[PDB]
Design a protein around this motif. Structure first.
Motif, PDB file in Angstrom:
ATOM      1  N   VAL A   1      17.193   5.294 -27.469  1.00 19.75           N
ATOM      2  CA  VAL A   1      16.694   4.772 -26.209  1.00 19.75           C
ATOM      3  C   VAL A   1      17.010   3.284 -26.154  1.00 19.75           C
ATOM      4  CG1 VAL A   1      14.722   4.470 -24.718  1.00 19.75           C
ATOM      5  CG2 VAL A   1      14.822   6.480 -26.211  1.00 19.75           C
ATOM      6  N   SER A   2      17.617   2.838 -25.045  1.00 21.33           N
ATOM      7  CA  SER A   2      17.813   1.409 -24.817  1.00 21.33           C
ATOM      8  C   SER A   2      16.473   0.739 -24.562  1.00 21.33           C
ATOM      9  CB  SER A   2      18.726   1.147 -23.610  1.00 21.33           C
ATOM     10  OG  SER A   2      20.016   1.681 -23.762  1.00 21.33           O
ATOM     11  N   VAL A   3      16.215  -0.367 -25.269  1.00 21.86           N
ATOM     12  CA  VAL A   3      15.009  -1.162 -25.067  1.00 21.86           C
ATOM     13  C   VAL A   3      15.391  -2.631 -25.128  1.00 21.86           C
ATOM     14  CG1 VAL A   3      13.568   0.668 -26.147  1.00 21.86           C
ATOM     15  CG2 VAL A   3      14.279  -1.287 -27.467  1.00 21.86           C
ATOM     16  N   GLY A   4      14.499  -3.470 -24.616  1.00 29.43           N
ATOM     17  CA  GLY A   4      14.570  -4.902 -24.831  1.00 29.43           C
ATOM     18  C   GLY A   4      13.510  -5.300 -25.835  1.00 29.43           C
ATOM     19  N   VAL A   5      13.779  -6.359 -26.582  1.00 30.96           N
ATOM     20  CA  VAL A   5      12.780  -6.930 -27.476  1.00 30.96           C
ATOM     21  C   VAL A   5      12.695  -8.430 -27.241  1.00 30.96           C
ATOM     22  CG1 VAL A   5      12.845  -5.197 -29.309  1.00 30.96           C
ATOM     23  CG2 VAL A   5      14.477  -7.115 -29.330  1.00 30.96           C
ATOM     24  N   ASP A   6      11.604  -9.006 -27.729  1.00 29.89           N
ATOM     25  CA  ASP A   6      11.488 -10.457 -27.803  1.00 29.89           C
ATOM     26  C   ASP A   6      12.127 -10.880 -29.112  1.00 29.89           C
ATOM     27  OD1 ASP A   6      10.913 -13.132 -27.708  1.00 29.89           O
ATOM     28  OD2 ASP A   6       8.732 -12.877 -27.874  1.00 29.89           O
ATOM     29  N   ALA A   7      13.347 -11.401 -29.034  1.00 31.58           N
ATOM     30  CA  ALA A   7      14.069 -11.847 -30.214  1.00 31.58           C
ATOM     31  C   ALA A   7      14.099 -13.366 -30.344  1.00 31.58           C
ATOM     32  CB  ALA A   7      15.488 -11.281 -30.209  1.00 31.58           C
ATOM     33  N   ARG A   8      13.317 -14.088 -29.530  1.00 29.88           N
ATOM     34  CA  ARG A   8      13.297 -15.558 -29.529  1.00 29.88           C
ATOM     35  C   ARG A   8      12.265 -16.075 -30.533  1.00 29.88           C
ATOM     36  NH1 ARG A   8      13.651 -16.759 -22.917  1.00 29.88           N
ATOM     37  NH2 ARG A   8      15.760 -15.863 -22.638  1.00 29.88           N
ATOM     38  N   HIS A   9      12.589 -15.903 -31.824  1.00 29.55           N
ATOM     39  CA  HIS A   9      11.739 -16.382 -32.922  1.00 29.55           C
ATOM     40  C   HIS A   9      12.664 -16.582 -34.107  1.00 29.55           C
ATOM     41  CE1 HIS A   9       8.199 -15.437 -30.599  1.00 29.55           C
ATOM     42  NE2 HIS A   9       8.704 -14.228 -30.414  1.00 29.55           N
ATOM     43  N   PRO A  10      12.571 -17.732 -34.804  1.00 32.12           N
ATOM     44  CA  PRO A  10      13.338 -17.900 -36.053  1.00 32.12           C
ATOM     45  C   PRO A  10      13.247 -16.707 -36.976  1.00 32.12           C
ATOM     46  CG  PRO A  10      12.339 -19.959 -35.491  1.00 32.12           C
ATOM     47  CD  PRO A  10      11.882 -18.977 -34.426  1.00 32.12           C
TER      48      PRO A  10
END
Ligand SMILES: CC(C)(C)C1CCN(CCCn2nc(-c3ccc(C(F)(F)F)c(CNCc4ccc(F)cc4)c3)c3c2CCN(S(C)(=O)=O)C3)CC1
Length: 220
Positions: A135-144
């Protein structure tokens, strides 16, 4: 009831990890990744689909800005309206915005429909991965911590439910009590577990994993 673990790579439904580079095309990789599995399911052949073709052609009409961002849902729509998408081998990824070069004679896949899932329902997401495919999803990847991840079940306390980075859920499981989602990224094989991150599951829509899931379908 539902299986405790799935891993669609074990069923030959997942292509090699890709390397998006400077271009913000995670949404396009997320979209072709999800379709690749639907195509293998239907035809028995596994072929990488052209993320570049999404970057170049699923543009203003679909709310996407190529390397500056896009949506998997409107990528699936592009493939529906376009009546095809090319193979990655015929339309290779160049990590930059180009003019649209879709040629129907190298059509590698079709898209009949796509389905979006309810925001934040990780049980609904779990069912779709089991019964439907990756399944295509988005994540919050804005973290060191996301960039620096090497192994384990990733948990970032400061993660939010707003998504900014497109990825593919190809399974789920448990690693000594820690429930996780198996996530195919597009940052090459040197990211995490040969290009995969296992992210916290059933932890209150951690990192927005289940905020915007969608999956395509190839009928007939
Ligand atoms: C086009 C149309 C028909 C009007 C659609 C209307 C419905 N829908 C928008 C609302 C659903 N939605 N989808 C997403 C969503 C889903 C997946 C991904 C990805 F990471 F996977 F890429 C992203 C990130 N990329 C954003 C990006 C898009 C086009 C650009 F140019 C540049 C950047 C966002 C979000 C929302 C709501 C707002 N957020 S938020 C902060 O999380 O609340 C994000 C899509 C567009």
């Amino acid at each position: 009831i539902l299986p405790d673990s799935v891993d669609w790579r074990e069923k030959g439904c997942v292509t090699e990890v890709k390397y998006q580079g400077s271009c913000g095309a995670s949404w396009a990789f997320s979209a072709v990744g999800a379709l690749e599995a639907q195509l293998k399911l239907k035809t028995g052949k596994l072929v990488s689909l052209s993320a570049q073709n999404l970057v170049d052609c699923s543009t203003e009409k679909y709310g996407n800005k190529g390397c500056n961002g896009g949506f998997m849902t409107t990528a699936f729509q592009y493939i529906i309206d376009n009546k095809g998408i090319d193979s990655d081998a015929s339309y290779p990824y160049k990590a930059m915005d180009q003019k649209c070069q879709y040629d129907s004679k190298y059509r590698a896949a079709t898209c009949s429909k796509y389905t979006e899932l309810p925001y934040g329902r990780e049980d609904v997401l779990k069912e779709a991965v089991a019964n439907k495919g990756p399944v295509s999803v988005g994540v919050d990847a804005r973290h060191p911590s996301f960039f620096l991840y090497r192994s384990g079940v990733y948990y970032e306390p400061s993660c939010t439910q707003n998504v900014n980075h497109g990825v593919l859920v190809v399974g789920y499981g448990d690693l000594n009590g820690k429930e996780y989602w198996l996530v195919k990224n597009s940052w090459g094989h040197n990211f995490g577990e040969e290009g995969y991150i296992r992210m916290a599951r059933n932890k209150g829509n951690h990192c927005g994993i289940a905020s915007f899931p969608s999956y395509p379908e190839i009928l007939q």
